Amino acid sequence: MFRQCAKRYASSLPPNALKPAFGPPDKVAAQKFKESLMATEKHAKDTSNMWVKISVWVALPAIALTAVNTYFVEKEHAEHREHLKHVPDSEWPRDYEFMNIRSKPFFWGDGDKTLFWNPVVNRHIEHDD
């Protein structure tokens, strides 16, 4: 019976459960910017895989130097002598066999046919196995 004790000018019905807002905001560029991003996909490809992959890149030209440095380290020792002496000729395994054909180059020599009886034994005549 008693409702609204004031005379209105136009029929209306303000909000009660929902607020339609009676004032258009100002910040509208913040939406069109974030909205364009959503659909527009920029993230792609694996950047982490390519990043670490660079390691091997510089690791190739780098080791190339360190690799040669090693040989240079023992270069001083190599030139030096400690074991494996090289003086006599008998030590040479090739010599013996080479001595055979050596009979031609020199041609002249002492005891060629007689000395030949030595190597001929190394040949060893086989029959079957």
| Residue 29 or 50 with smaller CB distance to its own copies | 29
Q: Map residues 31-50 to x or -, x wherever contact with its own copies holds by CB under 8 A.
A: ----x---------------
51 binds its own copies (CB under 8 A): no
Structure token digits, residue 71: 């040989």
Strand spans (E) along the chain: none
Structure tokens at 7: 């005379």
58 is a site residue for its own copies (CB under 8 A): yes
Nearer to its own copies by C-beta: 1 or 56?
Answer: 56
Q: Tell me if 73 contacts its own copies by CB under 8 A.
A: yes
Which pair of tokens denotes residue 91?
Answer: 């030590």
Using CB under 8 A as the binding rule, whether residue 104 contacts its own copies is answered as: no
75 binds its own copies (CB under 8 A): yes
Count of residues engaged in binding its own copies, rule: CB under 8 A? 13
Residue 59, CA distances (Å) to 35, 55, 66, 96, 119 in order: 44, 6, 11, 50, 56
Report the residue number, 31 or 100, with the smaller CB distance to its own copies. Answer: 31
Q: Which of 79, 114, 111, 118 is nearest to 95 (CA)?
A: 118
Alpha carbons 18 and 31: distance in angstroms, whole number: 23
